[PDB]
Design an enzyme around this catalytic site. Structure first.
Site, PDB file in Angstrom:
ATOM      1  N   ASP A   1       6.453   8.298  -3.929  1.00 16.20           N
ATOM      2  CA  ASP A   1       5.635   7.137  -3.711  1.00 16.20           C
ATOM      3  C   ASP A   1       4.662   7.069  -4.891  1.00 16.20           C
ATOM      4  O   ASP A   1       4.317   8.048  -5.464  1.00 16.20           O
ATOM      5  CB  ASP A   1       4.890   6.937  -2.338  1.00 16.20           C
TER       6      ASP A   1
ATOM      7  N   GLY B   1       5.826   3.514   4.806  1.00 16.43           N
ATOM      8  CA  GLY B   1       5.929   2.117   4.448  1.00 16.43           C
ATOM      9  C   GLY B   1       5.495   1.309   5.587  1.00 16.43           C
ATOM     10  O   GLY B   1       5.463   1.798   6.661  1.00 16.43           O
TER      11      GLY B   1
ATOM     12  N   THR C   1       0.867  -1.189   0.000  1.00 16.98           N
ATOM     13  CA  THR C   1       0.000   0.000   0.000  1.00 16.98           C
ATOM     14  C   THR C   1       0.868   1.189   0.000  1.00 16.98           C
ATOM     15  O   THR C   1       0.683   1.920  -0.900  1.00 16.98           O
ATOM     16  CB  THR C   1      -0.942  -0.016   1.288  1.00 16.98           C
TER      17      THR C   1
ATOM     18  N   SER D   1      -0.278  -3.163  -5.693  1.00 14.01           N
ATOM     19  CA  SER D   1      -1.117  -2.398  -4.788  1.00 14.01           C
ATOM     20  C   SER D   1      -0.799  -0.919  -4.989  1.00 14.01           C
ATOM     21  O   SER D   1      -1.748  -0.249  -5.293  1.00 14.01           O
ATOM     22  CB  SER D   1      -0.973  -2.741  -3.317  1.00 14.01           C
TER      23      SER D   1
ATOM     24  N   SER E   1      10.331   0.324   3.279  1.00 16.68           N
ATOM     25  CA  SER E   1       9.482  -0.830   3.144  1.00 16.68           C
ATOM     26  C   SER E   1      10.335  -1.990   2.909  1.00 16.68           C
ATOM     27  O   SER E   1      11.527  -1.819   2.934  1.00 16.68           O
ATOM     28  CB  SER E   1       8.333  -0.760   2.170  1.00 16.68           C
TER      29      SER E   1
ATOM     30  N   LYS F   1      -3.678  10.157  -2.626  1.00 16.25           N
ATOM     31  CA  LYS F   1      -2.578  10.656  -1.866  1.00 16.25           C
ATOM     32  C   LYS F   1      -2.324   9.932  -0.598  1.00 16.25           C
ATOM     33  O   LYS F   1      -3.256   9.688   0.094  1.00 16.25           O
ATOM     34  CB  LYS F   1      -2.758  12.154  -1.506  1.00 16.25           C
TER      35      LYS F   1
ATOM     36  N   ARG G   1       0.746   6.161  -5.679  1.00 12.77           N
ATOM     37  CA  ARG G   1      -0.513   6.369  -5.002  1.00 12.77           C
ATOM     38  C   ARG G   1      -1.385   5.087  -5.149  1.00 12.77           C
ATOM     39  O   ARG G   1      -1.038   4.137  -5.898  1.00 12.77           O
ATOM     40  CB  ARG G   1      -1.341   7.506  -5.549  1.00 12.77           C
TER      41      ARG G   1
ATOM     42  N   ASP H   1       6.813  -3.398  -8.887  1.00 12.87           N
ATOM     43  CA  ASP H   1       7.156  -4.429  -7.886  1.00 12.87           C
ATOM     44  C   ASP H   1       5.924  -4.855  -7.134  1.00 12.87           C
ATOM     45  O   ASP H   1       5.905  -6.031  -6.892  1.00 12.87           O
ATOM     46  CB  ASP H   1       8.117  -3.962  -6.761  1.00 12.87           C
TER      47      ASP H   1
END
Lengths: 234, 196, 205, 216, 219, 202, 245, 249, 246
Positions: free
Chosen positions: E17, E47, E1, E169, E129, E33, E19, E166
């Site tokens: 990142d 993360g 996520t 999500s 993460s 966001k 979204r 990768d």
């Protein structure tokens, strides 16, 4: 080790809709600093007496115009220490709203919560209620708002009100005068003229301090700017 | 099909109730008759069923609190609301994996609106309903109740139906009991019927 | 809503969006493994009128979350004159879930409501954590989240006529009802327009 | 051995009481695990000017016992009478705190040897972390209990009037077995003598083993 | 996520990142966001479980606001560091929030990475993460010693492109968040390269599976 | 768990340490500090795991903060190391972290104290510690002589740190070494970006 | 000095209109009536001397004490109202002991002097307690910071001292410490010098005969506060009689 | 000292009752008036704000009447200051009882619980009792439509039409005279409410800014609590002109 | 001024007067006058200087708390002005609050924030009479990180605002007007001048003068942001220069 001393009621009801000791607190804010607040209807502008009348003032952040949060500012009249706690408390309250809502605390709400401590200090023995009155601004509901919270804890709703030296006389002049539908630049000019009427002596830019609330957000005007407004109007 | 066995069917001018008498220690019934039907009032009846011991503790705490509403107003409290109110307290207790879960049956009469009956699960679910039963006994009667009567069915047929149901528990269920109490409620009050 | 499992509850909600109205479609039965207690019972409720919050699983938790949401709601409802927005509620209901420590909220809320006094559509689902989500696309929510969502994403447009959406949602319950094991016992459709809530009770056992 | 939940250990503490004096021998080698972190470490503490402490078992659990000990002497000075403790009271008060500390998951088999003469009363005390506390002739606990204590006790039972000299040669011999058997040290010791009037202890000095166990 | 990465030109932070906000591992929202604004110049990439990241960030968001307003002096990363430190240590593990805090502090520029436990350490580029490695590999190519603001933007769009591939999500937009002394850019879109959209075809069945029989209109 | 070491001159200390702060199997950050803000005058030598060090480092900052003002500015080494003992006391075997504390208090001369992860606090000559100091134990000991002199300490200390990152499977690129005086805490970076290797096996 | 028995001391939280509470002024007056207790800081320790009142030949060391060991390295010499001095010793004993548990070293007196002076001021603030009625000295020898001597008044001021005396004549004794250079002295010579001053300063109007009891925290007691060693005591005793004559 | 004063807060006086409790009633007299009236299908609250000023912005539209819950409403008669604390206690109690109860909060139940706090302070704690009498309006099933009155003395009362605040004796009779037991419906009752407020004020002239009017009317399945906007009250101020004639006739 | 009228039990309580005065606070000003300490503070752009008199009853002293210059945090420093007993208690409270800030903030605190925390705490004292306010006065000096050198002054009450230059002690008003002329005349701010201008002002108002040993000067220079006490030597360097300056 332990403290007692004074824990019986210090406050006795007077037939006037207020207690004796709070009535006396309202005289304290009157001998306080001149602060004026006028709602321009496209933001709120609040102006306060910068000085504590030593006339050495060198402000860069030590203001009495303080942003609490994104769109709330406070300017006060009366006591310094009593005010600092309200500012510290206000941020905690605004944020308390910010966590739940994801918007900070409306004008009405912030007033209800600050008001409850000010009364607390009255009824209780061994404490005295604040000597501070607040001019609280905010942008909520899609409209600018301005509230007055008195040292009692009572609230009076105002589109324009004045505090400090000649406060009583200040409220009647505003009640008649108050304006709306004002451009941002005009907002400052009207606010400074009203400040001239409350506050005596010299005004330059280390004597008066101005902050504005609008759509972009609350910020505090630089000492250069205030000077340009002051000159401009009669 | 949950825990211990209870059944009540309101026809909305009658209420039929029977509950087991059996607080069993080991493999013998230490007494024959045992109270599972509690009277908070003569016009409110709570039938608690679950654990033998748990039923009693839960009821008594709420019961002094129920009395407190009666003490102040000096008229009836809202009985439908008070049986729900205890349930809300049991929703807070439900997050905890401790069992204090009670399958309850509220019979109450309220003044102004009329009668109320509310069903409570051990999963804790409030329903006003035509007939509900707790544990295995819910399992036993719910399926015949649409077919063999109405929700306005006669006291005689109800009672015959009830007698047969209690005999089916002895006959089919691994939990038989040879003492069951039967009580019949008219539109306002408790009558104690013949034990079976 | 839910996204936890209960075999003591479990119910299913699919919502799809118009453009000045939002529809919520809901079962109206209750189950509990081998247990029912009602033909018909309410799940989504008003608390400031012509907005809804649903709570699903067993009936106590449904009622609990909703009242509790109102506890947070009422201060804003008093302070301002105008009744609270959709934006304010989305965070508020999330704050209610967020209140708990590690074992979170007993139901896992999905909110559907029109923005007060104005015709702006909103659909959101939330997780049982405090993870912030903005949604206005489409939402389906239950234990088997993926099953409410695939059909609810499929049916609408982001401007149909109100009626077309209501007939879609009636059908939405039926294909869903064949998709679950037996979970049914009455179908409720809720269309939220401007100031009016259309409620429909569909035919069945 | 015999030591649940230990990390930094003091291996072995000799304590044998003779007429008005105690000799305690404890190694300078203070293993933080298997590795000898400090080759010399004085495991002798000053309770008081009239008392002395020497301790064996985990060294971290010893510094804890030290802070508790330390305050008790302070209490007595604290009155203004300026008394020096009695060996039995300080050791005993702490034996109780070892009964409480068992219940939480940290373990103690902490073992201290108190010899004092103070006020007018002569104590020899040993205080444990499981709280076996007693007066004695000779004691040692923990790892001391598994290997030197029984030979020390065997001599002690028909001759209960061993002297500090007979014990000295025996201390040197036993520690030779510790360098070889224990994995928490390789020799080097501090010799501490407690008296009932002053606390004495020459600094840690090397010692080295003698080989004769590859003949057969 | 939430998979977050950051790069350093030689200033402070552009945090990037992809979204998407998820209800568990099912998408709640396609792309909205999830690199967040705290009050007005501190931003946090996130993360791990996104959730602990949001609430810790929000208390800290309260505390930095207290210091900014009186001082009129940049938002204090160290303050924000300490509060998180304090909460996570008591239990020894309480939620997992892996956070890239970044603001230019009153004196030096200060960048923090808070893991699941406590820390007190001070690096200058961290990628978070379990895909920290994927984000770091774009930076290690592109950025030799010294980089500029634009150049740092180009690595950042690239770190965000990698996480999208990768883990599915994370998807769609590459969000770039400029965090500075007094410039804080949040603009959703920085790169549209994909997008989650509604169908161009329509099929749905009307009244051949629909069942209705009663209506009323309550308020 | 990177190595921590502090080797004794006789008026100031030199520490040396290796870098990598790790998020399990994967190294999360190798551009970190090994002597972050612990006070404003005091140093501790840190490695180990990020959490084990941090809880201790902050409590010592807060106590140290009271100590420094009342006494007059410099704190005591022995006081500081005891505060760290407390954190470790609860988390006995839970945290493997051991902190290497090195200072110049107003107590007197140079003192190097080892606060253990057990709860032990001791003043000694020089020890190097970590969970990986059962690994570079020989290498410190050969360098460590009676009164190892400062110029010698720069080469010896850095090397011990170098030996660690190359060999380490919990080591990592760049030794960041820290030299502490009564002036404040000073870090230097000896590169390993550029090729430095403890000579290969056949 | 200002104070009147009516007004502005009828609660222990009442602030006087002069800026200094009447109660604190009363607390100092009691110190002024009492006997002289001296403590002089040396280069190698501190030497205390406090006169121990003897009203009967039945009395032992325990009767009419004024030397406490707050720690067991830190001493406390008090003068004034004994009742409050011994209670503040007990709370102080606890405060030192907790410090030793945590910190683990011979406590630096500079930290004690601030914490105790603030505590003495706290009792002037609060209604449930009234100010302390003694002035006392705290004195230690440590290796962490050396010899340290501080005195705290019942006002709740801490000041640092080379050598102070408190008694019936506070100013005459302090000029006499000034004349001599302790810089030239080691801890051994100081014991002689404290001993004389106590005899001359003190005026009998309430004594009948006193015994001088002195305490070392110095060289021959190793950084723990012990009563004076015998050799030192006898050197000290002769000089005190000789100085009279 | 503190031992040489009197204020007889927790101490009983020669009267047999405390000074502080009796004095609170005097403060209530010269502060804005609040009345609650009964209708057949609702209940309503009408109040005079504590603001006698000629210019209000309406930041908070509850400056006298605060809606606690979706099942309840209150008014303030007295000082706005003691009200602020009380308002916050009420938003919690009113919603808590509701979480459990799932039935509109009984008007009686609320007041007795509150009155207990008002008396707690005067008896013990050394605090004075709140200078505010709160006028509660609500609906529960087992009494019907209700109005209950709260005092600083811990006195409660079950009413159908009562007024507290300024010139209360006149006000309760005036509500009795126009409105008997169960007589007047909700709409006509809102008019009656303004008519008494015009007559009785601390300072004359009744305007939109000086008044706030609240309705409890049971809607379709929910009991709806609304505070009327200034605009709606104005339509009632003309209605109040019509009402004066109507009472007389 | 006013001594107030009672209508409550105002006489020994801090609660209101018709002036707005708090009785305990006004009594707090008389506590300043008890100590004998007066301070003159000057702000520059090179440094912030606080210079104040050091009390000598006798020549047997150690300077560690005879000192009225205190370290309230390593960068930002302060003086307590007034009665020394009230000063020590306040310094003590503040340091525990300062250390608390260290746990929260994690670093060197801004002068604006440091004065604000003390101000909130002293709000607790000012509202109570349970515990009388501490009748000391604090002038914090230090370099705020981006803005520059700052001189802020808190009263016993806790009233704080910025000033070009400030004064505290036995009489604020007389000291300020003397300082105001020094401010108008605005000198070139470098190290020697800012210290010297501060030192000349404190000496003119007393008309007793002093030697460098008799005063304690504490500066926060842009040279080292650490809070530093000059000591006998460094002050002396200014004094000899000052004599040659007209």
């Amino acid at each position: 080790m332990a403290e007692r001393g004074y824990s019986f009621s210090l406050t006795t009801f007077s037939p006037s809709g207020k207690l004796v000791q709070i009535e006396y607190a309202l005289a304290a804010v009157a001998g306080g600093a001149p602060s004026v607040g006028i709602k321009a209807a496209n933001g709120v502008v609040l102006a306060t007496e910068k000085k504590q009348k030593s006339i050495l003032y060198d402000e860069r952040s030590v203001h009495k115009v303080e942003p609490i949060t994104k769109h709330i500012g406070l300017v006060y009249s009366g006591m310094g220490p009593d005010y600092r706690v309200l500012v510290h408390r206000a941020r905690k309250l605004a944020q308390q709203y910010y966590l739940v809502y994801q918007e900070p605390i409306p004008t009405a709400q912030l007033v209800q919560r600050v008001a409850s401590v000010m009364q607390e200090y009255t009824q209780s023995g061994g404490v005295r209620p604040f000597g501070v009155s607040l001019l609280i601004c905010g942008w909520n509901e899609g409209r600018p708002y301005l509230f007055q919270s008195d040292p009692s804890g009572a609230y009076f709703a105002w589109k324009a009100t004045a505090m400090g030296k000649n406060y009583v006389n200040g409220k009647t002049f505003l009640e008649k005068r108050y304006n709306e539908d004002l451009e941002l630049e005009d907002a400052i000019h009207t606010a400074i003229l009203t400040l001239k009427e409350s506050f005596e002596g010299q005004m330059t830019e280390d004597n008066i301090e101005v902050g504005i609330c609008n759509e972009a957000g609350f910020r505090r005007l630089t000492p250069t700017e205030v000077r340009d407004y002051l000159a401009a109007i009669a | 099909m949950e825990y211990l066995i209870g059944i009540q069917g309101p026809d909305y001018v009658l209420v039929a109730s029977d509950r087991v008498a059996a607080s069993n220690i080991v493999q013998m019934k230490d007494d024959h008759d045992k109270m599972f039907k509690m009277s908070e009032k003569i016009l409110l009846l709570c039938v608690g069923e679950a654990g033998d011991t748990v039923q009693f503790a839960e009821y008594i705490q709420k019961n002094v609190q129920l009395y407190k509403m009666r003490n102040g107003y000096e008229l009836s409290p809202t009985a439908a609301a008070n049986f729900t109110r205890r349930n809300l307290a049991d929703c807070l207790r439900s997050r905890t994996p401790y069992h204090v879960n009670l399958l309850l049956a509220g019979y109450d009469e309220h003044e102004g609106p009329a009668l109320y009956y509310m069903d409570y699960l051990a999963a804790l679910a409030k329903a006003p309903f035509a007939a509900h039963g707790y544990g295995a006994f819910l399992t036993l009667s719910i399926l015949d109740r649409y077919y063999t009567p109405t929700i306005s069915r006669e006291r005689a047929v109800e009672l015959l139906r009830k007698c047969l149901e209690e005999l089916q528990k002895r006959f089919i269920l691994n939990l038989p009991t040879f003492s069951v109490r039967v009580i019949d409620k008219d539109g306002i009050h408790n009558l104690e019927n013949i034990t079976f | 809503m839910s996204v936890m499992s209960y075999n003591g509850g479990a119910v299913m909600a699919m919502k799809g969006k118009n453009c000045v109205a939002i529809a919520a479609d809901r079962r109206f039965g209750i189950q509990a493994q081998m247990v029912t207690t009602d033909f018909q019972k309410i799940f989504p409720m008003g608390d400031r009128l012509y907005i809804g919050l649903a709570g699903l699983a067993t009936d106590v938790q449904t009622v609990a979350q909703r009242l509790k949401f109102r506890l947070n709601l009422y201060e804003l409802k008093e302070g301002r004159q105008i009744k609270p927005y959709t934006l304010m509620s989305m965070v508020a209901n999330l704050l209610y879930e967020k209140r708990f420590g590690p074992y979170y909220t007993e139901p896992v809320i999905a909110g559907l409501d029109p923005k007060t006094f104005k015709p702006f559509i909103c659909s959101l689902d939330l997780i049982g954590c405090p993870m912030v989500t903005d949604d206005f696309v489409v939402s389906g929510t239950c234990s088997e989240q993926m099953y409410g969502m695939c059909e609810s994403l499929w049916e609408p447009n982001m401007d149909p006529e109100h009626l077309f959406e209501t007939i879609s949602q009636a059908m939405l319950n039926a294909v869903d009802r064949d998709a679950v094991s037996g979970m049914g016992v009455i179908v409720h459709i809720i269309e939220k327009d401007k100031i009016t809530t259309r409620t429909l009770k569909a035919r069945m056992d | 051995t015999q030591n649940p939940m230990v990390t930094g250990t003091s291996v072995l503490g000799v304590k044998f009481d003779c007429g008005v004096v105690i000799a305690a021998d404890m190694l300078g080698s203070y293993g933080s695990l298997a590795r000898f972190r400090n080759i010399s470490r004085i495991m002798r503490v000053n309770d008081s000017t009239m008392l002395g402490a020497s301790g064996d078992y985990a060294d971290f659990q010893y510094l804890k016992q030290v802070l508790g000990q330390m305050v008790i002497d302070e209490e007595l000075f604290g009155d203004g009478h300026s008394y020096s403790p009695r060996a039995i009271h300080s050791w005993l008060t702490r034996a109780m705190y070892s009964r409480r500390s068992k219940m939480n998951p940290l373990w103690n088999t902490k073992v201290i040897g108190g010899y004092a003469g103070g006020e007018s009363f002569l104590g020899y005390v040993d205080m444990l972390g499981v709280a076996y506390e007693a007066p004695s002739l000779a004691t040692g606990y923990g790892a001391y209990l598994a290997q030197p204590l029984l030979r020390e006790v065997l001599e002690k039972q028909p001759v209960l009037s061993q002297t500090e000299a007979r014990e000295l040669v025996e201390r040197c011999m036993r520690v030779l077995y510790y360098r070889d058997a224990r994995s928490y040290n390789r020799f080097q010791v501090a010799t501490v003598t407690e008296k009932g009037v002053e606390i004495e202890g020459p600094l840690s000095a090397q010692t080295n083993w003698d080989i004769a166990h590859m003949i057969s | 996520t939430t998979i977050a990465g950051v790069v350093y030109k030689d200033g402070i932070v552009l945090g990037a990142d992809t979204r998407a906000t998820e209800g568990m591992v099912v998408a709640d929202k396609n792309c909205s966001k999830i690199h967040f604004i705290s009050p007005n110049i501190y931003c946090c990439g996130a993360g791990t479980a996104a959730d602990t990241d949001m609430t810790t960030q929000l208390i800290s968001s309260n505390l930095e606001l207290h210091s900014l307003t009186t001082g009129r002096l940049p938002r204090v990363v160290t303050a924000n560091r300490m509060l998180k430190q304090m909460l996570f240590r008591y239990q020894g593990y309480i939620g997992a929030a892996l956070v890239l805090g970044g603001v230019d502090v009153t004196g030096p520029h200060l960048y923090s990475i808070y893991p699941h436990g406590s820390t007190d350490k001070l690096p200058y580029v961290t990628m978070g993460s379990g895909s920290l490695a994927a984000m770091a590999v774009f930076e290690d190519k592109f950025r030799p010693d010294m980089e500029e603001e634009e150049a740092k933007k180009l690595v950042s769009e690239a770190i965000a492109a990698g996480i999208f591939n990768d883990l599915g999500s994370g998807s769609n937009i590459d969000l770039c968040v400029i965090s500075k002394s007094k410039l804080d850019f949040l603009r959703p879109y920085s790169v549209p390269n994909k997008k989650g959209t509604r169908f161009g075809r329509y099929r749905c069945e009307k009244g051949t599976t629909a069942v209705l029989t009663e209506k009323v209109t309550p308020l | 768990t990177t190595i921590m070491a502090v080797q004794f001159d006789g008026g100031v200390v030199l520490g040396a340490d290796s870098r990598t702060t790790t998020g399990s199997y994967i190294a999360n950050r190798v551009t970190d500090k090994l002597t972050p803000i612990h006070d404003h005058i005091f140093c501790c030598r840190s490695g180990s795991a990020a959490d084990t060090q941090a809880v201790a480092d902050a409590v010592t900052y807060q106590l140290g903060f009271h100590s420094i003002e009342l006494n007059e500015p410099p704190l005591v080494h022995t006081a500081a190391s005891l505060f760290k003992e407390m954190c470790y006391r609860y988390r006995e075997d839970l945290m493997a972290g051991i902190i290497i504390a090195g200072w110049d208090p107003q107590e007197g001369g140079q003192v190097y104290s080892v606060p253990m992860g057990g709860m032990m606090v001791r003043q000694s000559f020089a020890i190097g510690g970590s969970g990986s100091s059962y690994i570079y134990g020989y290498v410190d000991a050969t360098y460590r002589e009676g009164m190892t002199k400062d110029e010698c300490l720069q080469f010896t200390a850095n090397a011990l740190a170098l030996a660690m990152e190359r060999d380490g499977s919990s080591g990592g690129v760049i030794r960041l070494a820290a030299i502490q005086q009564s002036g404040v805490e000073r870090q230097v970076l000896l590169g390993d970006q550029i090729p430095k290797v403890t000579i290969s096996t056949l | 000095m200002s104070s009147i028995g009516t007004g502005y001391d009828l609660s222990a939280s009442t602030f006087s209109p002069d800026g200094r509470v009447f109660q604190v002024e009363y607390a100092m007056k009691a110190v002024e009536n009492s006997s002289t207790a001296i403590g002089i800081r040396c280069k190698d320790g501190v030497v205390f001397g406090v006169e121990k009142l003897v009203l009967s030949k039945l009395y032992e060391e325990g009767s009419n004490k004024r030397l406490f060991n707050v720690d067991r390295h830190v001493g406390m010499a008090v003068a004034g109202l004994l009742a409050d001095a011994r209670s503040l010793a007990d709370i102080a004993r606890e405060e030192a002991s907790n410090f030793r548990s945590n910190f683990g070293y011979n406590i630096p007196l500079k930290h004690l002097a601030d914490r105790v002076a603030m505590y003495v001021h706290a009792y002037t603030l609060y209604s449930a307690v009234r100010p302390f009625g003694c002035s006392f000295m705290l004195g230690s020898y440590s290796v962490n910071d050396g010899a340290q001597l501080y005195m705290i008044d019942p006002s709740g001021v801490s000041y640092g001292y080379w050598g102070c005396a408190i008694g019936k004549a506070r100013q005459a004794a302090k000029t006499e410490i000034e004349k001599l250079q302790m810089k030239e002295m080691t801890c051994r010579d100081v014991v002689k010098e404290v001993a004389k001053i106590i005899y001359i300063v003190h005026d009998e109007v309430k004594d009948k005969a006193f015994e001088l009891e002195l305490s070392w925290v110095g060289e021959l007691t190793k950084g723990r506060h012990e009563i004076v060693p015998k050799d030192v005591r006898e050197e000290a005793e002769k000089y005190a009689k000789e100085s009279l004559k | 000292m503190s031992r040489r004063y009197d204020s007889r807060t927790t101490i009983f006086s020669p009267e047999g009752r405390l000074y502080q409790v009796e004095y609170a009633m005097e403060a209530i007299g010269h502060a804005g008036t609040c009345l609650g009236i009964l209708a057949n299908d609702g209940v309503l609250l009408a109040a005079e704000r504590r603001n006698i000023h000629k210019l209000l912005d309406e930041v908070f539209f509850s400056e006298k009447i605060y809606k606690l819950n979706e099942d309840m409403a209150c008014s303030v008669a007295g000082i706005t200051s003691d009200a602020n604390v009380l308002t916050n206690e009420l938003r919690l109690i009113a919603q808590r009882y509701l979480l459990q109860y799932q039935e509109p909060i009984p008007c009686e139940q609320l007041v007795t619980a509150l009155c207990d706090i008002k008396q707690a302070y005067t008896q013990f704690g050394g605090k004075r009792p709140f200078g505010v009498s709160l006028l509660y309006i609500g609906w529960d099933k087992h009494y019907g439509f209700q109005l209950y009155q709260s005092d600083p003395s811990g006195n409660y009362g079950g009413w159908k039409a009562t007024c507290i605040g300024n010139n209360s004796a006149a006000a309760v009779s005036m509500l009795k005279q126009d409105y008997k037991e169960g007589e007047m419906t909700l709409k006509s009752a809102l008019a009656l409410a303004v008519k008494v407020l015009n007559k009785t004020m601390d300072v004359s002239k009744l305007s939109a800014e000086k008044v706030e009017i609240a309705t409890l009317t049971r809607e379709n399945g929910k009991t709806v609590i609304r505070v009327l906007k200034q605009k709606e009250v104005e339509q009632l101020i003309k209605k109040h002109e019509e009402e004066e004639a109507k009472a007389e006739r | 001024m006013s001594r107030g009228s009672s209508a409550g039990f105002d006489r020994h309580i801090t609660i209101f007067s018709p002036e707005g005065r708090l009785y305990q606070v006004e009594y707090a000003f008389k506590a300043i006058n008890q100590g004998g300490l007066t301070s003159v503070a000057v702000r520059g752009k090179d440094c912030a200087v606080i210079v104040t008199q050091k009390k000598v009853p006798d020549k047997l002293l150690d300077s560690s708390t005879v000192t009225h210059l205190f370290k309230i945090t390593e960068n930002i420093g302060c003086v307590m002005t007034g009665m020394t007993a009230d000063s020590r208690s306040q310094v003590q409270r503040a340091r525990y609050e300062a250390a608390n800030w260290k746990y929260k903030y994690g670093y060197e605190i801004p002068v604006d924030m440091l004065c604000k925390r003390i101000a909130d705490i002293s709000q607790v004292y000012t509202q109570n009479a349970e515990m009388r306010p501490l009748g000391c006065c604090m002038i914090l000096i230090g370099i705020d990180e981006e803005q520059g050198p700052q001189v802020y002054k808190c009263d016993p009450a806790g009233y704080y605002c910025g000033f070009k230059a400030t004064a505290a002690g036995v009489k604020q008003t007389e000291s300020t007007s003397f300082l105001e002329k020094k401010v108008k005349k605005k000198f070139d701010w470098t190290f020697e001048q800012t210290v010297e201008t501060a030192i000349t002002c404190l000496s003119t108002v007393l008309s007793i003068d002093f030697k460098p040993s008799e005063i304690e000067v504490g500066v926060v220079t842009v040279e080292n942001p650490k809070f530093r006490i000059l000591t006998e030597a460094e002050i002396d360097a200014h004094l000899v220069a000052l004599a040659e300056r007209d």
